[PDB]
Design an enzyme around this catalytic site. Structure first.
Site, PDB file in Angstrom:
ATOM      1  N   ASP A   1       4.761  11.505  -1.797  1.00 55.43           N
ATOM      2  CA  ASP A   1       4.845  12.345  -2.991  1.00 55.43           C
ATOM      3  C   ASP A   1       4.158  13.683  -2.713  1.00 55.43           C
ATOM      4  O   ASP A   1       4.524  14.330  -1.733  1.00 55.43           O
ATOM      5  CB  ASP A   1       4.285  11.563  -4.211  1.00 55.43           C
ATOM      6  CG  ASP A   1       4.371  12.301  -5.524  1.00 55.43           C
ATOM      7  OD1 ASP A   1       5.482  12.420  -6.057  1.00 55.43           O
ATOM      8  OD2 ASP A   1       3.339  12.850  -5.962  1.00 55.43           O
TER       9      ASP A   1
ATOM     10  N   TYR B   1       9.628  16.899 -16.184  1.00 57.43           N
ATOM     11  CA  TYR B   1       8.231  16.476 -16.324  1.00 57.43           C
ATOM     12  C   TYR B   1       7.286  17.506 -15.709  1.00 57.43           C
ATOM     13  O   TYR B   1       6.192  17.702 -16.226  1.00 57.43           O
ATOM     14  CB  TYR B   1       7.999  15.062 -15.747  1.00 57.43           C
ATOM     15  CG  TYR B   1       8.072  14.989 -14.235  1.00 57.43           C
ATOM     16  CD1 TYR B   1       9.298  14.920 -13.580  1.00 57.43           C
ATOM     17  CD2 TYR B   1       6.916  14.971 -13.462  1.00 57.43           C
ATOM     18  CE1 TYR B   1       9.372  14.871 -12.190  1.00 57.43           C
ATOM     19  CE2 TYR B   1       6.979  14.890 -12.072  1.00 57.43           C
ATOM     20  CZ  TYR B   1       8.209  14.854 -11.441  1.00 57.43           C
ATOM     21  OH  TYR B   1       8.273  14.790 -10.075  1.00 57.43           O
TER      22      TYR B   1
ATOM     23  N   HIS C   1      10.005   4.887  -6.623  1.00 57.04           N
ATOM     24  CA  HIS C   1       9.066   5.958  -6.279  1.00 57.04           C
ATOM     25  C   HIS C   1       7.786   5.487  -5.598  1.00 57.04           C
ATOM     26  O   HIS C   1       7.291   6.181  -4.716  1.00 57.04           O
ATOM     27  CB  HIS C   1       8.700   6.792  -7.517  1.00 57.04           C
ATOM     28  CG  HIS C   1       7.784   7.929  -7.193  1.00 57.04           C
ATOM     29  ND1 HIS C   1       8.240   9.041  -6.495  1.00 57.04           N
ATOM     30  CD2 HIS C   1       6.442   8.037  -7.363  1.00 57.04           C
ATOM     31  CE1 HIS C   1       7.178   9.797  -6.303  1.00 57.04           C
ATOM     32  NE2 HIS C   1       6.080   9.252  -6.820  1.00 57.04           N
TER      33      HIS C   1
ATOM     34  N   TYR D   1       0.430  20.648  -9.437  1.00 55.99           N
ATOM     35  CA  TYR D   1       1.721  21.167  -9.934  1.00 55.99           C
ATOM     36  C   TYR D   1       1.620  22.589 -10.509  1.00 55.99           C
ATOM     37  O   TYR D   1       2.638  23.175 -10.880  1.00 55.99           O
ATOM     38  CB  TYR D   1       2.216  20.274 -11.087  1.00 55.99           C
ATOM     39  CG  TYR D   1       2.596  18.861 -10.724  1.00 55.99           C
ATOM     40  CD1 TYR D   1       1.664  17.833 -10.799  1.00 55.99           C
ATOM     41  CD2 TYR D   1       3.906  18.528 -10.408  1.00 55.99           C
ATOM     42  CE1 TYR D   1       2.017  16.518 -10.532  1.00 55.99           C
ATOM     43  CE2 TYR D   1       4.276  17.206 -10.168  1.00 55.99           C
ATOM     44  CZ  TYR D   1       3.324  16.210 -10.227  1.00 55.99           C
ATOM     45  OH  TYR D   1       3.639  14.914  -9.973  1.00 55.99           O
TER      46      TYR D   1
ATOM     47  N   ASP E   1      -6.696 -30.792  16.302  1.00 60.85           N
ATOM     48  CA  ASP E   1      -5.696 -31.286  17.249  1.00 60.85           C
ATOM     49  C   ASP E   1      -6.300 -32.359  18.165  1.00 60.85           C
ATOM     50  O   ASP E   1      -5.581 -32.943  18.977  1.00 60.85           O
ATOM     51  CB  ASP E   1      -5.116 -30.124  18.079  1.00 60.85           C
ATOM     52  CG  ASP E   1      -6.127 -29.403  18.952  1.00 60.85           C
ATOM     53  OD1 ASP E   1      -7.261 -29.203  18.498  1.00 60.85           O
ATOM     54  OD2 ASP E   1      -5.780 -29.059  20.090  1.00 60.85           O
TER      55      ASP E   1
ATOM     56  N   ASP F   1      -9.511 -26.075  12.777  1.00 57.27           N
ATOM     57  CA  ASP F   1      -9.973 -25.863  14.142  1.00 57.27           C
ATOM     58  C   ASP F   1      -9.292 -24.557  14.611  1.00 57.27           C
ATOM     59  O   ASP F   1      -8.338 -24.100  13.977  1.00 57.27           O
ATOM     60  CB  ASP F   1      -9.583 -27.043  15.070  1.00 57.27           C
ATOM     61  CG  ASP F   1     -10.169 -26.980  16.479  1.00 57.27           C
ATOM     62  OD1 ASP F   1     -11.158 -26.249  16.678  1.00 57.27           O
ATOM     63  OD2 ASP F   1      -9.618 -27.642  17.382  1.00 57.27           O
TER      64      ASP F   1
ATOM     65  N   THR G   1     -15.091 -24.266  15.008  1.00 61.68           N
ATOM     66  CA  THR G   1     -14.627 -24.245  16.387  1.00 61.68           C
ATOM     67  C   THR G   1     -15.687 -24.477  17.445  1.00 61.68           C
ATOM     68  O   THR G   1     -16.799 -23.949  17.341  1.00 61.68           O
ATOM     69  CB  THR G   1     -13.856 -22.917  16.685  1.00 61.68           C
ATOM     70  OG1 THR G   1     -13.586 -22.817  18.085  1.00 61.68           O
ATOM     71  CG2 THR G   1     -14.618 -21.652  16.242  1.00 61.68           C
ATOM     72  N   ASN G   2     -15.298 -25.212  18.515  1.00 60.03           N
ATOM     73  CA  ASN G   2     -16.087 -25.379  19.713  1.00 60.03           C
ATOM     74  C   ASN G   2     -15.660 -24.181  20.558  1.00 60.03           C
ATOM     75  O   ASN G   2     -14.513 -24.108  21.000  1.00 60.03           O
ATOM     76  CB  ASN G   2     -15.779 -26.701  20.450  1.00 60.03           C
ATOM     77  CG  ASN G   2     -16.583 -27.892  19.969  1.00 60.03           C
ATOM     78  OD1 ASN G   2     -17.400 -27.813  19.040  1.00 60.03           O
ATOM     79  ND2 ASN G   2     -16.270 -29.049  20.515  1.00 60.03           N
TER      80      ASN G   2
ATOM     81  N   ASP H   1      -8.581 -23.659  18.456  1.00 61.40           N
ATOM     82  CA  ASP H   1      -7.740 -24.046  19.597  1.00 61.40           C
ATOM     83  C   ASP H   1      -6.781 -25.197  19.237  1.00 61.40           C
ATOM     84  O   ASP H   1      -7.227 -26.245  18.767  1.00 61.40           O
ATOM     85  CB  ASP H   1      -8.609 -24.374  20.815  1.00 61.40           C
ATOM     86  CG  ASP H   1      -7.818 -24.482  22.095  1.00 61.40           C
ATOM     87  OD1 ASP H   1      -7.401 -23.431  22.624  1.00 61.40           O
ATOM     88  OD2 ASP H   1      -7.585 -25.614  22.545  1.00 61.40           O
TER      89      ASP H   1
HETATM   90  C1  LIG Z   1       6.069  15.491  -4.358  1.00 69.22           C
HETATM   91  N1  LIG Z   1       6.834  15.994  -5.486  1.00 69.22           N
HETATM   92  C2  LIG Z   1       5.933  15.726  -6.552  1.00 69.22           C
HETATM   93  C3  LIG Z   1       6.739  15.062  -7.465  1.00 69.22           C
HETATM   94  O1  LIG Z   1       5.824  14.805  -8.463  1.00 69.22           O
HETATM   95  C4  LIG Z   1       6.998  17.415  -5.463  1.00 69.22           C
HETATM   96  C5  LIG Z   1       6.755  18.215  -4.244  1.00 69.22           C
HETATM   97  C6  LIG Z   1       6.903  19.631  -4.298  1.00 69.22           C
HETATM   98  C7  LIG Z   1       7.295  20.200  -5.527  1.00 69.22           C
HETATM   99 BR1  LIG Z   1       7.553  22.035  -5.711  1.00 69.22          BR
HETATM  100  C8  LIG Z   1       7.540  19.412  -6.673  1.00 69.22           C
HETATM  101  N2  LIG Z   1       7.409  18.053  -6.660  1.00 69.22           N
HETATM  102  C1  LIG Z   2       5.363  12.278  -8.793  1.00 67.44           C
HETATM  103  N1  LIG Z   2       5.029  11.321  -9.766  1.00 67.44           N
HETATM  104  C2  LIG Z   2       4.648  12.029 -10.987  1.00 67.44           C
HETATM  105  C3  LIG Z   2       5.346  11.649 -12.231  1.00 67.44           C
HETATM  106  O1  LIG Z   2       4.482  11.031 -13.150  1.00 67.44           O
HETATM  107  C4  LIG Z   2       6.123  10.513 -10.097  1.00 67.44           C
HETATM  108  C5  LIG Z   2       5.718   9.355 -10.783  1.00 67.44           C
HETATM  109  C6  LIG Z   2       6.654   8.506 -11.312  1.00 67.44           C
HETATM  110  C7  LIG Z   2       7.972   8.742 -11.051  1.00 67.44           C
HETATM  111 BR1  LIG Z   2       9.085   7.445 -11.730  1.00 67.44          BR
HETATM  112  C8  LIG Z   2       8.416   9.878 -10.343  1.00 67.44           C
HETATM  113  N2  LIG Z   2       7.491  10.784  -9.882  1.00 67.44           N
END
Ligand SMILES: CN(CCO)c1ccc(Br)cn1
Ligand SMILES: CN(CCO)c1ccc(Br)cn1
Ligand SMILES: CN(CCO)c1ccc(Br)cn1
Ligand SMILES: CN(CCO)c1ccc(Br)cn1
Lengths: 546, 546
Positions: free
Chosen positions: B334, B382, B523, B465, B184, B8, B122-123, B10
């Site tokens: 990010d 990376y 992250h 990147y 109720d 219900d 419900t009413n 209310d």
């Molecule tokens: C947001 N991070 C990305 C990490 O993957 C970032 C921002 C600006 C620069 Br430059 C490098 N990395």
């Molecule tokens: C920004 N991203 C790109 C790296 O693959 C990221 C992802 C995982 C971790 Br953990 C840190 N940075």
């Protein structure tokens, strides 16, 4: 010969000049003449204002620097600024006071309509003030009407620096002699002139437009009142909501504020609201212009019962649910106008306010069959012709361009009877194969409808008329109710089917009903009289919808 | 065995019962006991209230009828209602006071999560009050969590009429013994019981849940705190905006109020905000969750330079222009967090407020190459591996399920190094071929990312990147600026790449900066700690964004 027109913003496309208030502030405070204008331009190219205009610093960072210059100037002039002197207050007030120069914009619109490339070239700033939205709104309204917007703070250059002019010519892809350049500052005009551009020093708008008219050979002054801004389909935000497994609804969305759901009629499109969408969004509303079920990009299932009012209304409620909207104002025309009254009757909690163009609210008669009721009115004969599945589809789908060209005509341009359609054996029996183009529509607009109707044709749309019994039975459940939410009935003098007279008893069922009436207006209200429709709708929305 | 649970509204899903205020109003005014409850139920099935509940009349039409019943009851009781007695005021106050019974909803959510079909029976009434939106909002929030909502005013039947129960069973497609029914009101429970349904008389929630827990064999009381509501992609409104000839941006849209633009990171989706979208919309915001350029349904052009910050930011400005938005609050994570700081620096007039998750604001160093800067930090290795076109694409696209399963892991579940990735020759070199599923994600959620990445793969995303030099040159133009608009920096304790410590000097460039900090958070902030993220964002939005 000219093919490009460049406009300044301050003192040209927007008035009063934010700059012209420095003199007014000086006079209001009895400060020595030119004191504030002098502190503003202090240090010239090396000064605070130039850094602001090049985008080196933001407006909020500039404010304390301008105060410092105001003090230095007052010290030299041997004057005291008052006790409560504030640059922020002065500039907030001046920016807020500045409006679009409508006649200047109209000339820019006319030039562009004639094939001119148009641009705004402005010395402006990065506005981070708590009140920055007012300026953002003004720039948004203005920029949409131009091919380019060149802002000094974004390009890192300022007028009168020669590089900004070379940048302008590059952007326009035009040699200087092809450019007419309008500015209220003689110093900023000089480099464009030195380049060989046609230049207009703007003091009063009318003289500036007279100069512009002479140089371009295009009439810009004393022209007929223009139509409201339309929509370019490829420039709109297109939204899609699945209301149930086989049904998705498409809509065009524009603006912010209270949700305003526009519901077209037969056989139309979201595009039938092209003249209302920009105006209502500019008026402070979030417009959702539907492709109603059976139309355009919305799903068109074949079953007749998928188009009864109960199902259509349930789907519009699901549509709001999925979008996360507790309410929307519903504005309908023709069959959409009918849907909108039923939304108000069955789902008032989901209806902020309701407005209909042409379509009155007539309660179901429980003592008479709906087919009996339709039969009694000669102008509704076309509705009996629409009953038999496939008959009207075959005629209406045979030649789409001919269909829309024959239908979409002003009250003084008909080629279409509407009565004795069955006896005649068709809608277009006494119609030309190649109708003339109505003053209401361009060939391009007709082709838009043609293209939309190629997807699903006329089955779904015609199905809206094939639920008379079902709709009547459902409508009878509402016979003891009244519409007490904000409501508007807009009648069209020359709609010979949905005649104003048919709305005469609406106050018995909608006591607080407000009205609008459009003279010399046929059935296609939105495109027949867009300016008047916009005026009526905006006034009613601001007063009764929030 | 049970497979359906009916609630219900209310006194069951919503409290305090709107009905229970009649007794409170009686006591507050010193009216004879049960007077108002008696006038409310006057005439039973033939009375005003039943007509209201069946949808024969609206709430505004019912109000004068209830007043009339209140008078008749007072006349019989030989009492006078006070001078200023108003049914509207009483009911407005009671409806507005009524809230969702969170523990009851959580039990309904848990039952449904376990395979139960759930419904609200419900009413209720057709609410046309000027204040109807409050109720519309409550019903909207509640109904989304159920398979069915059966409202008396929509079905034209009421509890305790036996037909509504047969209607309920029909809707559920279940035999009575398969249904647990909570109410109720003992009188409204009786027909469900008479049918052989399991019934729970609801007085206090905890006892009702203890009864429900015993009968279903599912733990509903004392359970761990649930995750926030997520998004089902097929149930969202999907929006599409062409920002330039070859680029269109896709977004998911939910809610009303100030626009909040969510900007994901690498390699993500609009779906990375699944836990934030319903919460922020429920908090009073219009959420626009982007598929950033290169991702999902947004365009992914191959050229590296299409992904530099200047171009990406220009496109987000065009995105707002086309949607008709003068501003939006920008929240990024990010790479999205990086974009959002640049939107604040270059387009402050278009940025209502700015918030970043994990990504700090670090000004460009004009004395050092960006490649030099990246090289100096071992955890950013990376990023050097990502530079060479095609290398990271080939590895990341080889096995999509493995990619996302390896990446999307909490701080205590890594299989991924991040440093010495180049030397190792790859991101997944010391990684299992079949990673275990992180506690953060379901298999289904992983498959969503897999399906999104099948369209364009990793070229566009990796291109974010590949603009280090270009981004650095553009960023250097902002070196004399400060961010003075409302700003929020959210640090994640266990993000080992975007470490909280890297945000330590942000106040030098953002003096009014506000902060949030999330402990034990890796992250993938939004999915790692959704409850905490929602709490931080909503509090900051309500205080600083409007
Ligand atoms: C947001 N991070 C990305 C990490 O993957 C970032 C921002 C600006 C620069 Br430059 C490098 N990395
Ligand atoms: C920004 N991203 C790109 C790296 O693959 C990221 C992802 C995982 C971790 Br953990 C840190 N940075
Ligand atoms: C309602 N529509 C359907 C008729 O084709 C309509 C259109 C044109 C005129 Br004229 C009147 N009604
Ligand atoms: C809106 N008009 C459609 C005219 O084509 C209308 C509304 C209800 C009924 Br019944 C018939 N016609």
């Amino acid at each position: 010969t000219l093919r490009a027109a460049v406009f300044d913003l301050d003192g040209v496309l927007a008035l009063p000049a934010v700059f012209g208030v420095l003199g007014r502030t000086e006079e209001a405070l009895a400060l020595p003449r030119g004191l504030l204008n002098d502190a503003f331009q202090k240090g010239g190219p090396e000064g605070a204002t130039t850094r602001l205009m090049k985008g080196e610093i933001t407006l909020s960072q500039w404010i304390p620097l301008m105060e410092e210059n105001c003090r230095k100037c007052s010290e030299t002039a041997k004057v005291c600024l008052p006790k409560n002197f504030s640059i922020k207050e002065i500039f907030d007030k001046a920016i807020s006071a500045r409006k679009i120069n409508r006649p200047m914009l109209q000339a820019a619109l006319m030039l562009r309509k004639k094939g001119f490339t148009t641009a705004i070239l402005t010395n402006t700033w990065l506005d981070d003030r708590a009140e920055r939205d007012g300026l953002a709104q003004l720039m948004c309204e203005l920029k949409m009407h131009f091919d380019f917007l060149i802002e000094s703070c974004q390009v890192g250059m300022v007028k009168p620096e020669p590089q900004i002019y070379k940048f302008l010519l590059d952007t326009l892809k035009a040699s200087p002699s092809e450019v007419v350049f309008l500015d209220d500052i003689g110093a900023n005009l000089k480099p464009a002139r030195d380049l060989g551009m046609v230049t207009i020093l703007v003091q009063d708008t009318d003289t500036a437009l007279k100069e512009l008219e002479k140089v371009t050979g295009i009439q810009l002054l004393n022209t007929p009142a223009p139509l409201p801004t339309s929509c370019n389909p490829s420039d709109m935000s297109h939204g899609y909501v699945t209301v149930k497994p086989r049904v998705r609804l498409h809509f065009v969305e524009l603006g912010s504020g209270p949700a305003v759901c526009l519901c077209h009629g037969f056989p139309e499109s979201w595009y039938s609201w092209r003249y209302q969408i920009p105006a209502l969004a500019q008026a402070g509303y979030r417009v959702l212009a539907m492709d109603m079920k059976g139309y355009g990009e919305s799903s068109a299932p074949p079953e007749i019962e998928e188009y009864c009012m109960e199902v259509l209304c349930k789907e519009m409620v699901t549509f709001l649910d999925k979008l996360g909207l507790s309410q929307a104002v519903f504005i309908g025309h023709d069959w959409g106008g009918m849907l909108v009254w039923y939304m108000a009757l069955f789902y008032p909690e989901r209806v902020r306010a309701v407005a209909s163009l042409n379509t009155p609210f007539i309660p179901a008669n429980p003592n008479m069959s709906p087919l009996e009721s339709i039969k009694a009115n000669p102008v509704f004969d076309y509705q009996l012709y629409f009953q038999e599945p496939g008959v009207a589809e075959a005629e209406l789908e045979q030649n789409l361009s001919r269909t829309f060209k024959s239908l979409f005509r002003a009250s003084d341009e008909s080629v279409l009877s509407m009565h004795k359609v069955c006896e005649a054996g068709g809608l277009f029996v006494n119609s030309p194969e190649e109708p003339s183009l109505s003053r209401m529509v361009t060939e391009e607009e007709i082709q838009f409808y043609v293209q939309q109707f190629k997807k699903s044709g006329f089955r779904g749309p015609l199905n809206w008329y094939r639920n008379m019994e079902r709709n009547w039975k459902w409508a009878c459940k509402s016979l003891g109710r009244k519409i007490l939410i904000p409501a508007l009935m807009v009648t069209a003098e020359k709609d010979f089917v949905l005649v104003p007279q048919m709305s005469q008893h609406m106050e018995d069922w909608i006591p607080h009903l407000k009205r609008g009436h459009i003279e010399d207006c046929g059935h296609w209200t939105q495109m027949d009289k867009p300016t008047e429709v916009n005026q009526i709708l905006i006034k009613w929305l601001d007063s009764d919808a929030r």
